[PDB]
């Protein structure tokens, strides 16, 4: 249940980002899951796929303030209440 909240990049990379966060959920889908392992997976996948200097962040209540390259930023929400931010720098 992906709910995109703020988009900056191109729709293809949008789709692949959603697919990768999904695959991360399945890699870690259990009460013992940690968002950190899925974060590692998201960042490393987007590195080996669309280049380095990616950054994955997952949570539900927090406050970031980060610098991002244009057309390389996404933030979104899940019906499962997972707010997911990703960005390249």
């Amino acid at each position: 249940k992906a709910i995109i909240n703020s988009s900056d990049m191109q729709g293809d990379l949008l789709q692949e980002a959603q697919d990768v966060i999904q695959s991360g959920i399945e890699n870690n889908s259990a009460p013992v899951l940690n968002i950190e392992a899925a974060c590692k997976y998201i960042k490393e996948n987007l590195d080996k796929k669309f280049g380095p200097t990616w950054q994955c962040i997952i949570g539900e209540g927090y406050a970031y303030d980060v610098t991002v390259q244009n057309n390389t930023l996404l933030f979104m929400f899940y019906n499962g209440n997972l707010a997911v931010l990703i960005f390249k720098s």
Binding site: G59, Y62, A63, F75, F77, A83, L85
Partner: protein, 39 residues
């Protein structure tokens, strides 16, 4: 005189010109934003 008179000849090669031209690259630009985290 004894060997009969010789015959002049001519040959020259093709000589390209030397030009001095200099060009530039530039450091690509970058962006720096800041955003907050929503509920």
């Amino acid at each position: 005189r004894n060997k009969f008179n010789y015959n002049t000849r001519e040959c020259q090669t093709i000589n390209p010109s030397i030009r001095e031209r200099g060009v530039s690259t530039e450091p690509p630009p970058s962006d720096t934003i800041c955003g907050n985290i929503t509920q």
